[PDB]
Design a protein around this ligand. Structure first.
Ligand SMILES: O=C(O)CCc1ccc(O)cc1
Lengths: 1024, 183
């Protein structure tokens, strides 16, 4: 009667409710006592018992005592004459020079150690282990790479390394300290008005601290102008220290002059310094204190004790240092031969063929197939395919895309560049190993997918013959493309009158600027393309139209493409925000991307770079070759500035697991680590810390599952106290922010959370001199299971919406906490102290849960006139978080993913799928302000719909939403650049199209405003 | 612009013509209600299949990595063995020099202990090779299940898109005339 008695026979009673191998092959963490086969020079195998944690000095010394009890001891030298060696898990044979290292940290395969006399006697040069540890793959694995492009990248890219090292020691020690400790500084020295008003007539109280014995410290409260520089602030604090009943006025002036330049300003509690003449306000720390109603606490640090701290980078140069295409008078043809390794079931599948096409992002000719020959087993075609386009019409960035399909459905895919890194048109036979069908891609062929054969051997290997033409066919030089443009110009001037479908006009002159404004994802029509392409000379008037123009150009007509190359040549530089579109997958031409990197060199500030650095590293995936202008740009900026370098390293080191980029990023990381100076040692200490934490949580998750929290937690604390964990997890820099140092582990504040990912709550001592002034404890979460990079990105997108709103005079407060993905579903999350899930607030207030409990809880923290401003904080944050949330379309918000702070700020966490991923299998509103919230907005009131507080709040929502709608070009493009990462929520442009509807860009701003309210009104049921 | 791509998506070669969408030969230029249930029935079969497609794509890239792990482990074993092979040769150098250097003073005492070492060393090499050998046959049975993962993805993928397509067409039909959330 429940089930109409329908059985399920299939159902049996006994997914519901990785991994990186550990310290030894096949086991996560070596046993506390292990036996180690020691191969001696004399041929004797002597097995020693060792402690997991024992150093190689400890081991060697003990070995050479035990070696006396064995035969042939007289053959052996002193212990000091030898170094250890063994086969590691990456499968190379490391020579273990640093004998302070311990047995568990060696990444050995099997537990044996061979003894030898050290060869390659320049031992200096075999601290490439350092470089390989940081990168996570050995440098000898690049050495034996056959491909010339790689080897030519490796040697060529040192141009950059050298040039950037030379800027570092241009004013040493000042430039060196400016590299290592660069000034963390806002975009403009111009101030927002809501910030200014918090100044009582352009003035900050500041506190300059000093140390003199060392134990005792001394405040000096200056009240100075916000726009004054650090050198001024430093003088003022010296005046105050040294004024006395024994120094005349003039005596003081002569005491400041000797003193004024022996000091610099440090932030109390972290390694930030004020080394550059900027307004104090233009440093982020100051501008942070003003907003939070805090008193900047600086420190006078003498420069000799700062340059005493600094190193010497000492960069060493490594050991590793026709026919014009337009002559070829034929149409393109490519021979499909045979796939070898196709996994096809004969029982469902009819027939299989190789679909093909040439591409430029979008298509340049009739995409074809071949005949449905030898389907399923035995699969083999022998056809030249014939493509309607001439060999000279092929543009520099042309690419063959193919796929083996079913009947309609893809099985595999792979893409090749039709020219090589040296412009040579592809001839011969190629063996293309294929990539597998992704999630969101249902379409046949996949041209957004990466160029290159799969390094993975056991995959569909489709081979093919390319056409030969009596020579290496090379793409024409720029001088020759120029001349041909200059001819296409003078030629077209003489063409005669009656002519279809190609001075000016006033009606038209505005309609181009009409097009210029439309977002990337507003598709342009053939008429418009023609219309643009004909006025292309007037289009330089509006350099912002360029993306529309480039997409309008016919890339299959070399006459056009030579003309367009020549416009670009001296096109006027444009804004980074818009130029960034020119590095996404739709603009693959090198002259184009060249022009975009030339905009960044002029315009993009080291500040704005690091904001968009994620997007720029992703956009490397869409370059055709390894050596290209963007790579050299970023490589330079990273070696110019160690804050960028840090995140530049990690964003690469994150993706190294991913075989689409392991080569390219691997090679790039090598260059970085070879040039970045002493930061390589700092990165290796982070890299070593993160590994332990991975191996530790990897055990908690496999085997130690099914043991009470208590049991795991005792096993954790047992592990963390081991000397190697102590070594590895204590004196280092937080990767979320290298400014913050991490000292001793407070293991009693350190625990495993409730979650089934077994995320670690970790807590370090902030070992700064003035820790007290900023925070005595730095705590951050390490999370093994989840994929951080959706969150990482949504967090970024928020940070930018904030900066947009605030630099445009309106103060909604977002709290984009730190999130760093350091690997394949591994990462770090910043802990916001003094914050609780609404659901804790409801549990801890629950009488043996009333809608007021939140509001009650909040009053109970914020009493007096404090309360009034603390509601303003909640009202301001909650508005911003409404609009952002709506615009992005993040996961449904609820009581255990919403968080409020003691001071009354609210913010979201664990955002989940960002562009409305789950729901699309609509225009949802994910932040539904329940009664709980509306009560808090309306200090006492019932009927919260009706108050002014809600009208106020509504106004904040409307002003924010339109503010983002004017910078939507950016938000589209930021997401467009993120297509590179295989985030399922961003597989294709139509995924990004959600952000159009929700921002309502096809409508007019007034309609948009109403749509937002319409959307807000039905979700809430009344008010707007 | 948003919907016009999700209906032109997966079809053949402002008029939104699909050759990528060429916006403008142009070289010269009845139950009502019961079809509503079918939506839910197919919208459950489609999302039923999704996870079965998802679970396998993980297992695929697991086994892809699990296999690639196993290969390098062999590359390592082989290198490990080579050092043990080198070592047993390294002992046959200086052991057989020291047999005939004296061969007098504690001949039977010493050569037994030198011979013992050589034996342990060989028997070690014996264990590693069988350790390797065992990995390699486990590698093929992995590469087996691997071949089977793609096979079953490439049976489901056609059925998934057709299921998807009919689900849209039904969903179009209902909107033509005139709730859908629960279905
Ligand atoms: O030059 C610097 O080092 C400061 C950063 C900076 C870079 C480019 C620019 O145009 C202005 C400023």
């Amino acid at each position: 009667s429940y089930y109409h008695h329908h059985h399920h026979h299939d159902y049996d009673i006994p997914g519901a409710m990785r991994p990186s191998s550990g310290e030894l092959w096949g086991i996560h963490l070596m046993p506390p006592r292990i036996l180690v086969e020691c191969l001696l020079p004399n041929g004797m195998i002597v097995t020693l018992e060792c402690l997991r944690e024992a150093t190689l000095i400890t081991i060697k010394h003990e070995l050479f005592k035990e070696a006396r009890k064995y035969p042939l001891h007289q053959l052996l030298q002193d212990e000091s004459s030898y170094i250890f060696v063994s086969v590691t898990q990456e499968a190379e044979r490391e020579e273990f020079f640093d004998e302070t290292r311990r047995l568990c940290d060696l990444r050995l395969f099997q537990p044996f150690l061979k003894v030898i006399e050290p060869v390659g006697n320049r031992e200096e040069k075999i601290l490439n282990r350092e470089i390989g540890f940081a990168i996570g793959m050995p440098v000898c694995e690049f050495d034996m790479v056959k491909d010339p492009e790689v080897q030519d990248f490796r040697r060529n890219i040192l141009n950059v390394c050298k040039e950037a090292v030379d800027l570092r020691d241009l004013n040493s020690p000042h430039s060196r300290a400016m590299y290592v400790y660069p000034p963390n500084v806002e975009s403009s020295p111009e101030l927002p008005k809501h910030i200014y008003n918090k100044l009582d007539k352009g003035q900050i109280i500041v506190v300059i601290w000093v140390i003199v014995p060392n134990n005792d410290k001394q405040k000096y409260t200056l009240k100075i102008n916000h726009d004054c520089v650090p050198e001024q602030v430093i003088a003022e604090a010296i005046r105050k220290k040294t004024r006395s009943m024994l120094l005349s006025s003039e005596q003081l002036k002569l005491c400041v002059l000797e003193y004024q330049g022996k000091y610099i300003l440090k932030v109390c509690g972290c390694d930030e310094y004020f080394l550059e003449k900027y307004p104090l306000s233009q440093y982020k720390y100051i501008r942070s204190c003003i907003m939070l109603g805090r008193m900047p606490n600086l420190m006078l640090m003498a420069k000799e004790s700062l340059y005493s701290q600094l190193p010497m980078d000492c960069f060493t140069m490594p050991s590793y240092s026709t026919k014009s295409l337009w002559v070829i008078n034929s149409a393109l043809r490519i021979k499909i031969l045979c796939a070898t390794y196709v996994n096809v079931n004969i029982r469902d599948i009819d027939k299989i063929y190789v679909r093909t096409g040439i591409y430029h992002g979008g298509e340049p000719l009739c995409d074809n197939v071949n005949t449905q020959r030898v389907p399923c087993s035995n699969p083999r075609w022998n056809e030249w395919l014939n493509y309607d386009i001439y060999i000279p019409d092929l543009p520099r960035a042309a690419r063959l895309c193919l796929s083996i399909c079913s009947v309609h459905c893809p099985l595999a895919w792979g893409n090749i560049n039709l020219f090589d890194y040296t412009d040579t048109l592809v001839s011969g036979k190629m063996a293309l190993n294929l990539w597998p069908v992704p999630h969101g891609l249902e379409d046949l062929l996949n041209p957004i997918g990466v160029t290159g054969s799969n390094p993975n051997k056991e995959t569909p290997c489709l081979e093919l013959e390319f056409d030969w033409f009596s020579s290496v066919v090379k793409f024409p030089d720029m001088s020759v493309i120029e001349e041909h443009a200059n001819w296409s110009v003078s030629r077209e001037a003489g063409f005669s009158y009656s002519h279809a479908g190609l001075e000016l006009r006033e009606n038209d002159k505005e309609q181009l600027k009409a097009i210029s404004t439309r977002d990337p994802l507003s598709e342009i029509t053939e008429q418009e393309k023609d219309f643009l392409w004909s006025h292309r000379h007037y289009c330089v008037t509006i350099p912002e139209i360029l993306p529309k123009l480039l997409l309008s150009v016919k890339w299959n007509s070399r006459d056009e493409v030579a003309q367009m190359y020549c416009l670009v040549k001296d096109w006027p530089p444009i804004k980074p925000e818009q130029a960034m579109e020119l590095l996404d997958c739709n603009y693959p031409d090198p002259m184009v991307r060249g022009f975009a990197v030339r905009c960044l060199e002029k315009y993009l500030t080291d500040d704005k770079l690091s904001q968009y650095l994620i997007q720029l590293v992703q956009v490397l995936k869409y370059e055709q070759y390894l050596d290209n202008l963007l790579v050299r740009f970023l490589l330079k900026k990273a070696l110019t500035n160690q804050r960028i370098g840090h995140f530049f390293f990690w964003h690469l080191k994150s993706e190294m697991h991913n075989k689409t980029v392991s080569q390219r990023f691997g090679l790039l990381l090598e260059s970085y680590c070879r040039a970045c100076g002493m930061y390589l040692k700092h990165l290796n200490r982070q890299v070593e810390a993160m590994e332990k934490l991975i191996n530790l949580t990897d055990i908690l998750k496999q085997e130690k599952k099914d043991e009470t929290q208590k049991v795991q937690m005792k096993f954790l604390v047992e592990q963390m106290r081991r000397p190697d964990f102590m070594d590895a997890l204590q004196g280092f820099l937080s990767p979320l922010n290298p400014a913050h140092q991490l000292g001793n582990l407070r293991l009693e504040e350190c625990r495993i959370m409730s979650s089934a990912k077994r995320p670690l709550w970790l807590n370090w001592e902030n070992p700064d001199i003035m820790s007290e002034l900023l925070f005595q404890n730095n705590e951050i979460i390490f999370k093994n299971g989840d994929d951080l990079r959706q969150d990482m990105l949504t967090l970024q997108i928020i940070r930018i919406m904030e900066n947009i709103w605030q630099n445009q005079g309106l103060d909604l407060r977002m709290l984009p906490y730190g999130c760093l993905s350091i690997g394949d579903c591994v990462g770090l999350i910043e802990v916001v102290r003094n914050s609780h899930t609404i659901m804790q607030i409801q549990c801890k207030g629950g009488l043996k849960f009333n809608s007021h409990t939140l509001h009650q809880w909040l009053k109970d923290k914020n009493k007096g006139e404090i309360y009034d401003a603390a509601i303003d904080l909640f009202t301001r944050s909650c508005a911003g978080y409404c609009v952002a949330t709506f615009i992005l379309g993040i996961g449904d918000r609820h009581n255990s993913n919403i968080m409020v702070k003691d001071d009354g700020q609210l913010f979201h966490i664990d955002f989940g799928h960002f562009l409305d991923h789950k729901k699309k299998k609509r225009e949802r509103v994910p932040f539904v302000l329940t009664q709980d919230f509306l009560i808090v907005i309306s200090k006492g009131a019932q009927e919260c719909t009706k108050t002014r507080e809600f009208e106020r709040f509504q106004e904040m929502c409307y002003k924010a939403y339109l503010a983002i709608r004017q910078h939507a070009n950016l938000f589209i493009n930021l997401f467009s650049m993120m297509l590179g990462s295989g985030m399922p929520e961003l597989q294709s442009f139509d995924d990004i199209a959600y952000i159009r509807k929700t921002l309502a860009l096809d409508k007019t701003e007034q309609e948009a405003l109403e749509y937002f309210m319409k959307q807000m009104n039905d979700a809430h049921h009344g008010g707007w | 612009r948003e919907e016009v791509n999700e209906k032109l998506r997966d079809t053949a070669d402002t008029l939104t013509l699909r050759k990528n969408n060429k916006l403008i030969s142009l070289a010269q230029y009845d139950n009502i209600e019961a079809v509503g249930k079918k939506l839910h029935e197919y919208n459950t079969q489609f999302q039923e299949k999704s996870r079965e497609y998802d679970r396998l794509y993980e297992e695929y890239t697991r086994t892809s990595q699990e296999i690639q792990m196993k290969r390098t482990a062999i590359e390592a074993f082989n290198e490990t063995i080579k050092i043990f092979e080198e070592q047993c040769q390294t002992q046959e150098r200086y052991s057989k020099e020291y047999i005939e250097k004296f061969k007098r003073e504690g001949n039977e005492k010493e050569i037994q202990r030198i011979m013992h070492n050589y034996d342990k060393l060989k028997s070690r090499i014996s264990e590693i090779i069988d350790s390797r050998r065992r990995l390699e046959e486990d590698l093929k049975k992995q590469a087996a299940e691997y071949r089977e993962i793609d096979k079953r993805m490439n049976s489901i993928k056609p059925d998934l898109i057709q299921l998807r397509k009919t689900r849209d067409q039904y969903l179009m039909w209902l909107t033509q005339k005139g709730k859908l959330n629960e279905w």
